[PDB]
PDB file of C-alpha atoms and ligand atoms in Angstrom:
ATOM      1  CA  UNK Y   1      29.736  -3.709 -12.045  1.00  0.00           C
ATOM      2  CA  UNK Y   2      29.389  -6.296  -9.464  1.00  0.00           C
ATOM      3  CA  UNK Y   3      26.509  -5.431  -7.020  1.00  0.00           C
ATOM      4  CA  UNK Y   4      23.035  -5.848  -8.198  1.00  0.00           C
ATOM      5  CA  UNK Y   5      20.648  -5.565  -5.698  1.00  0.00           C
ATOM      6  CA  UNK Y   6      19.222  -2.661  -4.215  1.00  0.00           C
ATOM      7  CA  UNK Y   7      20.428  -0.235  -1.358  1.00  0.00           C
ATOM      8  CA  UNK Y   8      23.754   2.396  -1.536  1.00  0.00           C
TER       9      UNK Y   8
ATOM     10  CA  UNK T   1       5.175 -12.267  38.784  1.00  0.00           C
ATOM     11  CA  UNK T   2       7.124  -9.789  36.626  1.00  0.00           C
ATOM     12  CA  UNK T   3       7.078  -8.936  33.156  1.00  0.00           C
ATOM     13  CA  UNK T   4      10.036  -8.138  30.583  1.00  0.00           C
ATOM     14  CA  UNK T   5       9.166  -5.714  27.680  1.00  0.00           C
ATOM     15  CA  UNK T   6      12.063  -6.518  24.871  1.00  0.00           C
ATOM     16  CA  UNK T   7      12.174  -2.878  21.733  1.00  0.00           C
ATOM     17  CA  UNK T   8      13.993  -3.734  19.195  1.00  0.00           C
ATOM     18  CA  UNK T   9      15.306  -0.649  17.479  1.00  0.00           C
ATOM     19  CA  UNK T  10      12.507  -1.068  14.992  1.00  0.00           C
ATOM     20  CA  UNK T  11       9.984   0.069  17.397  1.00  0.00           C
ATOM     21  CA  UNK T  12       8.691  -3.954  17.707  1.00  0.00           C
ATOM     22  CA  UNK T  13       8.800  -5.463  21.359  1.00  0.00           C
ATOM     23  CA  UNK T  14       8.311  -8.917  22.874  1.00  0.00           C
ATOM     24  CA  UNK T  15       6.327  -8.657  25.990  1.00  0.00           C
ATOM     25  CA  UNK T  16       5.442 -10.941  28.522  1.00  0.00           C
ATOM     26  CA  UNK T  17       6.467 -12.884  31.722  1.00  0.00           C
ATOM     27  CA  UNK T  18      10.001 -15.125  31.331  1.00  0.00           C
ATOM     28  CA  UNK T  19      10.726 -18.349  33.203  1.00  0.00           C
ATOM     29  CA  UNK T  20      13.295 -19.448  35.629  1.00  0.00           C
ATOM     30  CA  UNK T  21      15.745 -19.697  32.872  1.00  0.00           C
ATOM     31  CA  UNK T  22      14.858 -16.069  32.694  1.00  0.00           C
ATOM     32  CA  UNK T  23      13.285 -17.082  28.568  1.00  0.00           C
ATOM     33  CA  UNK T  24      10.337 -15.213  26.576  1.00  0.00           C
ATOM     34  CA  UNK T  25       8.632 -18.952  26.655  1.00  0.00           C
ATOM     35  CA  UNK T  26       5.059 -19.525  27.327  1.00  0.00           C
ATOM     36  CA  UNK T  27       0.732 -19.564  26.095  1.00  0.00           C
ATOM     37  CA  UNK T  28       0.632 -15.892  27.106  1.00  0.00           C
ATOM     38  CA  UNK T  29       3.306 -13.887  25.459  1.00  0.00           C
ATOM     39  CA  UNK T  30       3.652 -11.422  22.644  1.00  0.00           C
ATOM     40  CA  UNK T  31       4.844  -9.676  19.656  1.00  0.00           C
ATOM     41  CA  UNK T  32       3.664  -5.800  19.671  1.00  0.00           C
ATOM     42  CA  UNK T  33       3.944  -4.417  16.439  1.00  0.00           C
ATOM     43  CA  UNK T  34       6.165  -0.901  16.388  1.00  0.00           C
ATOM     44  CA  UNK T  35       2.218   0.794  16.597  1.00  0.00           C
ATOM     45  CA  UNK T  36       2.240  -0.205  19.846  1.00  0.00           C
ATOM     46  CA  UNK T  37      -1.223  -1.542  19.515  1.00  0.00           C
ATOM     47  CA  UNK T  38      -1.149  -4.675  16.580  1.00  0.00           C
ATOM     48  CA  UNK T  39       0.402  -8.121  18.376  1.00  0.00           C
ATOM     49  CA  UNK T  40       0.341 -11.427  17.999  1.00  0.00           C
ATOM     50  CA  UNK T  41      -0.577 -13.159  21.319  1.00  0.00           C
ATOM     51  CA  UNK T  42       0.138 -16.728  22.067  1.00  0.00           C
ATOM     52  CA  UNK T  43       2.776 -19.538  22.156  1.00  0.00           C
ATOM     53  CA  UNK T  44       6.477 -18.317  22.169  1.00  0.00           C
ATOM     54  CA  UNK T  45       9.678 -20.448  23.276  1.00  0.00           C
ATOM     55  CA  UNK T  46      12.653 -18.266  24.384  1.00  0.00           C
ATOM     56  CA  UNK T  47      11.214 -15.200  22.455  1.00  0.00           C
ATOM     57  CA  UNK T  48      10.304 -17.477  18.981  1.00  0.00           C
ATOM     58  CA  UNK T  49       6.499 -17.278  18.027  1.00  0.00           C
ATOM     59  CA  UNK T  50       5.445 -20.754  17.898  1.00  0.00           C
ATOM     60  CA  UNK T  51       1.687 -19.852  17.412  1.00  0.00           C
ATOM     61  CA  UNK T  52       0.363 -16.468  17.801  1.00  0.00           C
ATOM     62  CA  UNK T  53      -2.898 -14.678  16.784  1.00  0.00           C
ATOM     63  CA  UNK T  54      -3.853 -11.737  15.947  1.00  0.00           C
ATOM     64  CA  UNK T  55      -5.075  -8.963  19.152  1.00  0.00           C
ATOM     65  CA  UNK T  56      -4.844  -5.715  19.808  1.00  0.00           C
ATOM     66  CA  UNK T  57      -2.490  -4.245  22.817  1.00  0.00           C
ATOM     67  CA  UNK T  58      -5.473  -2.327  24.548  1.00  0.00           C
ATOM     68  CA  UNK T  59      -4.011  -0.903  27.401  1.00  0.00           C
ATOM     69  CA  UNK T  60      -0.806  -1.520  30.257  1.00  0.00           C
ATOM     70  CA  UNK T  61      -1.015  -1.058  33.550  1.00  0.00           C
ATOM     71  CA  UNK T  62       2.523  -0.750  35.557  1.00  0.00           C
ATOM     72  CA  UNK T  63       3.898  -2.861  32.374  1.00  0.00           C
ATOM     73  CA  UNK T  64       1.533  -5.391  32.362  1.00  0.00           C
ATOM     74  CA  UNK T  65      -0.232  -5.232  29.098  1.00  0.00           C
ATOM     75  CA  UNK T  66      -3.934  -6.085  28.538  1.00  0.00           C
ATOM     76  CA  UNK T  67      -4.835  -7.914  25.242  1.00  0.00           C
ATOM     77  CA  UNK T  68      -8.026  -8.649  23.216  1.00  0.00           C
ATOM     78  CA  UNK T  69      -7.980 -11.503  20.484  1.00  0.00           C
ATOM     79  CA  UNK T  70      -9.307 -10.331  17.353  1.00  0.00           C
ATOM     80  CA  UNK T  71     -12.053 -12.454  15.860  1.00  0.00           C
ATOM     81  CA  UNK T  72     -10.593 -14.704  13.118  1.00  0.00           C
ATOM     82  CA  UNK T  73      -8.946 -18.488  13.106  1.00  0.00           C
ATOM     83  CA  UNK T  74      -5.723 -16.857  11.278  1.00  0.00           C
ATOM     84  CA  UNK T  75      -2.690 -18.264  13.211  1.00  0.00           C
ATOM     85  CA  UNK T  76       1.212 -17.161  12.445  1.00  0.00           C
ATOM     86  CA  UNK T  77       4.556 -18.457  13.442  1.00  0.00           C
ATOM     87  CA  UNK T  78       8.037 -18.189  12.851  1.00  0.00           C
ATOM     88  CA  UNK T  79       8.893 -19.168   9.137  1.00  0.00           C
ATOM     89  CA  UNK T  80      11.848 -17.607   8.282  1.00  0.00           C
ATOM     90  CA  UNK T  81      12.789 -18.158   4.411  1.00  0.00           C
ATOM     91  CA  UNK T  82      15.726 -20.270   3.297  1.00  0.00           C
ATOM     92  CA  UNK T  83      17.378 -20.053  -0.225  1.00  0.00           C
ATOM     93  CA  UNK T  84      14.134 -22.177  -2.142  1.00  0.00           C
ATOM     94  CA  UNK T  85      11.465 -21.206   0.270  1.00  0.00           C
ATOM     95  CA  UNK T  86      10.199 -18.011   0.532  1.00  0.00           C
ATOM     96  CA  UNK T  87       7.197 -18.688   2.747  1.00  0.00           C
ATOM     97  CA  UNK T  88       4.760 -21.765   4.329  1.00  0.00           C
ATOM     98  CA  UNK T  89       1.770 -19.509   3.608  1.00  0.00           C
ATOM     99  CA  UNK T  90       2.586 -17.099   0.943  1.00  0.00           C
ATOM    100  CA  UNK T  91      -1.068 -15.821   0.730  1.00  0.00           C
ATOM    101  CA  UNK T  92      -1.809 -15.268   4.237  1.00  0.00           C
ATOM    102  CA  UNK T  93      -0.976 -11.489   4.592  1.00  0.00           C
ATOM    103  CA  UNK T  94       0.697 -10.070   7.507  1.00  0.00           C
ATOM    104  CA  UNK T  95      -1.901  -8.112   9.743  1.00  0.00           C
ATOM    105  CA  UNK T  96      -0.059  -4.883  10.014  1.00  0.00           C
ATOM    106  CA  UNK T  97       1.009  -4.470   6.595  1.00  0.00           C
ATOM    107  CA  UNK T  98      -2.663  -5.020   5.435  1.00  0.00           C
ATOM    108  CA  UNK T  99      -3.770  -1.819   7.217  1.00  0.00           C
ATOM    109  CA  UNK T 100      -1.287   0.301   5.952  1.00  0.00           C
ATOM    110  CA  UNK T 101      -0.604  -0.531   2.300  1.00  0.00           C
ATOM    111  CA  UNK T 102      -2.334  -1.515  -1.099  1.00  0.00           C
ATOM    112  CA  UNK T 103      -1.176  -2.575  -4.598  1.00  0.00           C
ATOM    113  CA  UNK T 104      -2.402  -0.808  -7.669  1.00  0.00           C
ATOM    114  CA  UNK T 105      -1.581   0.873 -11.002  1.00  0.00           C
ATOM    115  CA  UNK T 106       1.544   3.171 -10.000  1.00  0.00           C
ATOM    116  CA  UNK T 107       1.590   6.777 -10.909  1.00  0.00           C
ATOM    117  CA  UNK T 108       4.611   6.065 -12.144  1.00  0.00           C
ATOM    118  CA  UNK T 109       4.350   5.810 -15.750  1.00  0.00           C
ATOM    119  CA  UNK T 110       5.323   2.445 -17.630  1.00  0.00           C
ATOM    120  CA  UNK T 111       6.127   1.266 -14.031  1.00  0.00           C
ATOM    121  CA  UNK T 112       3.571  -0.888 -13.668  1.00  0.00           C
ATOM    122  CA  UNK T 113       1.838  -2.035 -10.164  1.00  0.00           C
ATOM    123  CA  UNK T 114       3.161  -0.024  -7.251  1.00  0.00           C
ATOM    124  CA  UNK T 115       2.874   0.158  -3.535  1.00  0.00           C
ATOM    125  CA  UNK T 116      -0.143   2.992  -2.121  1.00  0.00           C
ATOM    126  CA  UNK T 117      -0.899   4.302   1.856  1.00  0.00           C
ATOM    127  CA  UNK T 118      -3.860   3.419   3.192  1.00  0.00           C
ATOM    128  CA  UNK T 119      -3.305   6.192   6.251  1.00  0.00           C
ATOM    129  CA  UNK T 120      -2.452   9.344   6.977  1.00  0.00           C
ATOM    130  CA  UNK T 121       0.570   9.207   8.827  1.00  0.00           C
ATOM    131  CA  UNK T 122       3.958  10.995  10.264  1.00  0.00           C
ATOM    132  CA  UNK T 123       7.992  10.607   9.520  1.00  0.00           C
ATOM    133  CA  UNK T 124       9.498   7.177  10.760  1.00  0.00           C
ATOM    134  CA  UNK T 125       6.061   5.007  10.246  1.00  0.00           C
ATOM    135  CA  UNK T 126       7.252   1.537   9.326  1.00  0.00           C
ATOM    136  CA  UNK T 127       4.472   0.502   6.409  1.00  0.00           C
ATOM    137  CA  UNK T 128       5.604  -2.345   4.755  1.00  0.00           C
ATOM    138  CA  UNK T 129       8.285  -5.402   5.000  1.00  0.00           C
ATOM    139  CA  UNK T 130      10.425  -6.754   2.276  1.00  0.00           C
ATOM    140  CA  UNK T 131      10.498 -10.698   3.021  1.00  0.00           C
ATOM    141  CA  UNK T 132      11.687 -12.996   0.637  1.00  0.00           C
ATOM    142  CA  UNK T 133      13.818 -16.057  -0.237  1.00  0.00           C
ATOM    143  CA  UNK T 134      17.500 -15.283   0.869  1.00  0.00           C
ATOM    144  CA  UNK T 135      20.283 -15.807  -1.250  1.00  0.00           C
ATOM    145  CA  UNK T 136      23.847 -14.536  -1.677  1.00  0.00           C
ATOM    146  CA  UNK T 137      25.769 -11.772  -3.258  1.00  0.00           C
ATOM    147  CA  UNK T 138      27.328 -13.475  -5.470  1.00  0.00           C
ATOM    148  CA  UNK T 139      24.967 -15.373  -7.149  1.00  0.00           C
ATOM    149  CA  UNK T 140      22.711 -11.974  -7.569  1.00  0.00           C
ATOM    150  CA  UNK T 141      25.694 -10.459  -8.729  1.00  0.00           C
ATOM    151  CA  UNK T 142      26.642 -13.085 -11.309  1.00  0.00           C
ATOM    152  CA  UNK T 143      23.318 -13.205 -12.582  1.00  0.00           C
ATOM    153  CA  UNK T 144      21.068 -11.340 -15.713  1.00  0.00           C
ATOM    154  CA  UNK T 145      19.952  -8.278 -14.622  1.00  0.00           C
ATOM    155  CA  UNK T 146      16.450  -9.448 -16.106  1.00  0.00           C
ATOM    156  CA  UNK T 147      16.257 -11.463 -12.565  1.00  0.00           C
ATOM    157  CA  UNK T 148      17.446  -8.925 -10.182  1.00  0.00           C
ATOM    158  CA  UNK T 149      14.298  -6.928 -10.319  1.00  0.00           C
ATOM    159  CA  UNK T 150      13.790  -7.233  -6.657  1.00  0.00           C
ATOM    160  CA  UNK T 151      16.521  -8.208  -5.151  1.00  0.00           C
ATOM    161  CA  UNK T 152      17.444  -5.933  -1.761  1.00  0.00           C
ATOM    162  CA  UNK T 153      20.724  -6.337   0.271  1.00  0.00           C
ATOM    163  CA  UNK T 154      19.746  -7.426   3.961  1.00  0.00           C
ATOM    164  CA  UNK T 155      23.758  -7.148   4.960  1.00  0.00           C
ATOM    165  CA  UNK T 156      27.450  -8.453   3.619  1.00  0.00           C
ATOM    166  CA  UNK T 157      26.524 -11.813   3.325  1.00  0.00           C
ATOM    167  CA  UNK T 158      22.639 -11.896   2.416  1.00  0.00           C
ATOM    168  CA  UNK T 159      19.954 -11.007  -0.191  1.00  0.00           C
ATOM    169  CA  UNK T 160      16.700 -11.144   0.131  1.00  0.00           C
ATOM    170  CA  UNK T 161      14.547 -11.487  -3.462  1.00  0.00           C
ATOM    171  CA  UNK T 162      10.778 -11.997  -4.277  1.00  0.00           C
ATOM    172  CA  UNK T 163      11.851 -14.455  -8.051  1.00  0.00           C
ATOM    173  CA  UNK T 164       9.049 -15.058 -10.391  1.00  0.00           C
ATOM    174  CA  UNK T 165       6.512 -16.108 -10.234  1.00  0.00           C
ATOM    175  CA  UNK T 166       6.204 -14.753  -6.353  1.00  0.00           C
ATOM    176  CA  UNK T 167       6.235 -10.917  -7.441  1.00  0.00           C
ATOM    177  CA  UNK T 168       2.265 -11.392  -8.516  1.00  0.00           C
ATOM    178  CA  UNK T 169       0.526 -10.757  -5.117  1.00  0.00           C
ATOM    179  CA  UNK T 170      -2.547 -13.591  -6.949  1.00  0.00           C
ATOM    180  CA  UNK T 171       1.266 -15.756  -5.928  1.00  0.00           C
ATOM    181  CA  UNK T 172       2.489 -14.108  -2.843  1.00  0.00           C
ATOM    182  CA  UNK T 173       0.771 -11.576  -0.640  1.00  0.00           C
ATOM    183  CA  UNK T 174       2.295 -11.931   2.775  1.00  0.00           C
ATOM    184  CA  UNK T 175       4.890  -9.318   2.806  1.00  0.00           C
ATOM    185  CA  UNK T 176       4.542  -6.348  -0.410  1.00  0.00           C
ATOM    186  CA  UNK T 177       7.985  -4.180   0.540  1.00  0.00           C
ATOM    187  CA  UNK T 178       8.496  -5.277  -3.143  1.00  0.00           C
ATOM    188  CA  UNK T 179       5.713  -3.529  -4.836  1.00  0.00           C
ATOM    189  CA  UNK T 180       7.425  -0.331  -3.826  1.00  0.00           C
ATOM    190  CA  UNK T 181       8.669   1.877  -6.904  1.00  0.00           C
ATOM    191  CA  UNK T 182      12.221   3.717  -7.067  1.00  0.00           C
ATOM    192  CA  UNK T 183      11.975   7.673  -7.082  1.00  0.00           C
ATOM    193  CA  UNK T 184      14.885   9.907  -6.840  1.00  0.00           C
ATOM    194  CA  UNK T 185      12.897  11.891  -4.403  1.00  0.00           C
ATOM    195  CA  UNK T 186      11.726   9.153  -2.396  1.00  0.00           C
ATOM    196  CA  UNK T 187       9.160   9.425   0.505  1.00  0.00           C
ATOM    197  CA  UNK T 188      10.355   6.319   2.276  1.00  0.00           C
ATOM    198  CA  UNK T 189      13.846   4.252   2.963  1.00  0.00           C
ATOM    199  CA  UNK T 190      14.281   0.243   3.520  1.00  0.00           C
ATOM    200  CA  UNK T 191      15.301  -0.519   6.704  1.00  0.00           C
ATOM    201  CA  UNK T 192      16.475  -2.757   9.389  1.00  0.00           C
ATOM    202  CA  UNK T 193      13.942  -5.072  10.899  1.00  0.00           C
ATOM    203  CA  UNK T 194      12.991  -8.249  13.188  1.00  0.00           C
ATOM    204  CA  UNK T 195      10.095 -10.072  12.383  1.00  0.00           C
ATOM    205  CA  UNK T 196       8.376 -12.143  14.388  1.00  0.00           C
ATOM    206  CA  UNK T 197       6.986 -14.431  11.681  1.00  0.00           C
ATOM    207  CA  UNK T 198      10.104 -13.583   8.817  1.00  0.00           C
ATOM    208  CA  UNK T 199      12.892 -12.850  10.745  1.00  0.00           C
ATOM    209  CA  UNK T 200      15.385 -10.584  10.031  1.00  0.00           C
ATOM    210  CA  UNK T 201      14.411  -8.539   7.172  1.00  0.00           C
ATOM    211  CA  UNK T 202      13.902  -5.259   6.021  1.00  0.00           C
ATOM    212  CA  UNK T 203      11.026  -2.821   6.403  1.00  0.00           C
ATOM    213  CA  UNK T 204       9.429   0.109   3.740  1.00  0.00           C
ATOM    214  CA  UNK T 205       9.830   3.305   6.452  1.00  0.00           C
ATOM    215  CA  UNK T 206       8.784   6.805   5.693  1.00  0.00           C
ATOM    216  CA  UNK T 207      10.746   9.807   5.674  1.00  0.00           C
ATOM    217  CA  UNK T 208       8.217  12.253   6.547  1.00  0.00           C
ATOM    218  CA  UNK T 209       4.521  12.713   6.462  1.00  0.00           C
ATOM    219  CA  UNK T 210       2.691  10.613   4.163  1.00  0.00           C
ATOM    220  CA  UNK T 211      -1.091  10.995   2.772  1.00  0.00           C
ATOM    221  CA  UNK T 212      -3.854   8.277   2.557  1.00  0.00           C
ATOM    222  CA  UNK T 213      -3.521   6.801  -0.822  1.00  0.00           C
ATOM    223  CA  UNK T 214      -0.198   8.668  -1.472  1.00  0.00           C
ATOM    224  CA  UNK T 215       2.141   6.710  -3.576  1.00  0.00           C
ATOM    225  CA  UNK T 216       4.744   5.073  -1.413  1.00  0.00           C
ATOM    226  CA  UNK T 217       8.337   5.232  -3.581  1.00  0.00           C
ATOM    227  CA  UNK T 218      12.222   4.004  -1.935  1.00  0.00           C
ATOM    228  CA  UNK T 219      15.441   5.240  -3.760  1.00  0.00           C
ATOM    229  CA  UNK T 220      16.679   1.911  -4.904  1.00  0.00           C
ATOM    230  CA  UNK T 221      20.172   3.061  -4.719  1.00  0.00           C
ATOM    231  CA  UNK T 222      22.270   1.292  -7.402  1.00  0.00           C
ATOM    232  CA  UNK T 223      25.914   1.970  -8.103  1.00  0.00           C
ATOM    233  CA  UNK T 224      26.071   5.014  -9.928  1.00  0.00           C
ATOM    234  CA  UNK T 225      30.022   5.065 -10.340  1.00  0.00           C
ATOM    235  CA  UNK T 226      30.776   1.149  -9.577  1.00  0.00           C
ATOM    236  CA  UNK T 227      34.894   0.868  -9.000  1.00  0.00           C
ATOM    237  CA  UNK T 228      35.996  -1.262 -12.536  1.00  0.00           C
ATOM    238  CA  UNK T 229      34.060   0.376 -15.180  1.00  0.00           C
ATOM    239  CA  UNK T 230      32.990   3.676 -15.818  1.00  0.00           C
ATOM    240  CA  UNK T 231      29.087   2.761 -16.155  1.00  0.00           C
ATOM    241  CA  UNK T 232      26.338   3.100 -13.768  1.00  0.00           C
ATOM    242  CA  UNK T 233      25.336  -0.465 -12.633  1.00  0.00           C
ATOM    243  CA  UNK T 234      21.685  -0.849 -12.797  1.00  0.00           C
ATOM    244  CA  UNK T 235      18.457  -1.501 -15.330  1.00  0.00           C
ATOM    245  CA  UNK T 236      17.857   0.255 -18.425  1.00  0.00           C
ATOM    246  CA  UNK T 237      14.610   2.017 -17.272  1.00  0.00           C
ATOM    247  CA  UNK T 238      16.826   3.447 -14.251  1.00  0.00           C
ATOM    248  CA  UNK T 239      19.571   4.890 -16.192  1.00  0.00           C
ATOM    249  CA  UNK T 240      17.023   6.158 -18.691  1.00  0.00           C
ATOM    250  CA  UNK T 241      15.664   8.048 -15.390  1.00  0.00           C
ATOM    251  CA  UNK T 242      18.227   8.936 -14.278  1.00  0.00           C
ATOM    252  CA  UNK T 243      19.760  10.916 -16.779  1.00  0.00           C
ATOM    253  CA  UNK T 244      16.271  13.060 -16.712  1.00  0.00           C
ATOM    254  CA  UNK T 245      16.403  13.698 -12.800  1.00  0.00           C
ATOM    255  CA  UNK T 246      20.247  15.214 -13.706  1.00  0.00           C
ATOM    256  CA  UNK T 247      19.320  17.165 -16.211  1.00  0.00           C
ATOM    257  CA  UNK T 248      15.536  17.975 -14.737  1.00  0.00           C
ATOM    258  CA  UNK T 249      16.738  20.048 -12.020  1.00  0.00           C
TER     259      UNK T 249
HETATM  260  N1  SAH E 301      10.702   4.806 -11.388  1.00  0.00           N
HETATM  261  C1  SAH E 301      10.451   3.730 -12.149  1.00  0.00           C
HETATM  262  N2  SAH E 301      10.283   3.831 -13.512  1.00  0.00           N
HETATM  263  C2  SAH E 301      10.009   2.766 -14.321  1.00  0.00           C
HETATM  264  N3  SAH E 301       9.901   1.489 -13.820  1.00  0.00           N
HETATM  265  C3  SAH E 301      10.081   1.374 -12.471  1.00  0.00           C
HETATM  266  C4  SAH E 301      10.355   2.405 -11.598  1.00  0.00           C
HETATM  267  N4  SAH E 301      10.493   1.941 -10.265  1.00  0.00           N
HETATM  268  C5  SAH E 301      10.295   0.674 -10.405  1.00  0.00           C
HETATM  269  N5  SAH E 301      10.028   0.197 -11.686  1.00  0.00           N
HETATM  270  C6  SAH E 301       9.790  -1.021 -12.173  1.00  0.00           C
HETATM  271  O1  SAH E 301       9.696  -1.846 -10.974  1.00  0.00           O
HETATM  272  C7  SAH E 301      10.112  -3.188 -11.031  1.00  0.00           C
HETATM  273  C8  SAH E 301      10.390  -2.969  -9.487  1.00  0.00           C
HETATM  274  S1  SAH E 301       9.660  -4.137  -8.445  1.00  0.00           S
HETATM  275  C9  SAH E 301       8.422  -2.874  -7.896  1.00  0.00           C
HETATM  276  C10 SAH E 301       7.097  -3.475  -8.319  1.00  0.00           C
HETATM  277  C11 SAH E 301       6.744  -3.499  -9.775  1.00  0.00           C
HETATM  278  N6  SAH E 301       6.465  -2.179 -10.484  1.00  0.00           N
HETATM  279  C12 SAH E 301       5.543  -4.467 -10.069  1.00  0.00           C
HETATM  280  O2  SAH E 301       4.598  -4.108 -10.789  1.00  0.00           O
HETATM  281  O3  SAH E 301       5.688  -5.642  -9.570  1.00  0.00           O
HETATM  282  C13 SAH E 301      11.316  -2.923 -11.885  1.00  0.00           C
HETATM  283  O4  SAH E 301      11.886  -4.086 -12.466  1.00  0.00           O
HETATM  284  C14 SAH E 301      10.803  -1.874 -12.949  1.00  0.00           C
HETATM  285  O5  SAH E 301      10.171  -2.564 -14.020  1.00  0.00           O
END
């Protein structure tokens, strides 16, 4: 939803 | 005279003999790559590479380390990327990286060029970096998905991307982390690291053991249950797998 860029 | 050997947790180490102010700064010092046996020899100021070419570690005796230039005029130095620039050389390759990785078709299919071993090697090998221009959270975050194809979170407050049209190595060929391809059953994991000539960055770091001309493939790790909506955050072609790996096994 916010984050969009790799790596959890 | 005494010399200072400086591991980062990477496995890279600055080597070589400090002044009074007790500095990495001097003709004769050096990066050593985490192989132990790739460096860049030369110029440094207070551990910066101000001009350093390519040789190969080939022995130490009582920590003093015995180098041999390798022929060549290439030179590198510290050119860490800011927001707009992503490199002052973008086609001169980095050294290391060039003997342990290659672009071609991916195995993957549909996922077009990917990221291939040159070497045979064991768990924890660093094989690749991810360099790019650096930009922040939010503007990834507020952006099209369409241009987040390669963004990678170095921490909280930084992103590192490779934008158009820097993701065709014919554009850019001095770091390829980014040619890497996402698998759910990855053989390698991004991770911390300090480059001499990029700064801090990230590196492509296997797992386990890892064949010559084996595909190398990173879990890219998108939200799968983001907090505010019930839907996976992430590209079309990864939700698509997604669902498969699930319901595969
Ligand atoms: N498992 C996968 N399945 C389908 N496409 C994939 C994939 N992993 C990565 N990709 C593709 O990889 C781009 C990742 S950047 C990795 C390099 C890229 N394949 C290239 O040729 O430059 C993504 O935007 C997506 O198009």
């Amino acid at each position: 939803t916010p984050r969009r860029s790799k790596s959890a | 005279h005494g010399v200072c050997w400086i591991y980062y947790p990477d496995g890279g180490s600055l080597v070589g003999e400090v002044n009074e102010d007790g500095e990495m700064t001097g003709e004769k010092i050096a990066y050593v790559y985490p192989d132990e046996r790739t460096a860049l020899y030369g110029k440094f100021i207070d551990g910066e590479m101000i001009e350093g070419k390519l040789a190969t570690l080939m022995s130490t005796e009582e920590g003093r380390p015995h180098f041999e230039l390798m022929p060549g005029n290439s030179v590198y130095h510290f050119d860490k990327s800011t927001s707009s620039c992503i490199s002052t050389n973008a086609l001169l390759p980095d050294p290391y990286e060039s003997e342990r990785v290659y672009v071609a078709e991916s195995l993957i299919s549909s996922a077009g060029e990917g990221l291939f071993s040159k070497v045979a090697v064991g768990p924890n090998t660093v094989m690749s970096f991810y360099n790019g221009v650096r930009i922040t959270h939010q503007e990834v975050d507020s952006r099209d998905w369409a241009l987040n194809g390669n963004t990678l979170s170095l921490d909280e407050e930084t992103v590192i991307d490779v934008p158009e049209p820097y993701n065709h190595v014919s554009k850019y060929c001095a770091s390829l982390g980014h040619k890497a391809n996402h698998s759910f059953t990855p053989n390698c994991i991004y991770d911390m690291f300090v480059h001499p000539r990029f700064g801090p960055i990230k590196c492509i770091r296997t797992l386990r053991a890892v064949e010559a001309d084996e595909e190398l493939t990173v879990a890219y790790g998108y939200d799968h249950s983001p907090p505010g909506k019930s839907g996976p955050e992430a590209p079309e072609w990864y939700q698509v797998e997604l669902k498969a790996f699930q319901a595969t096994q």
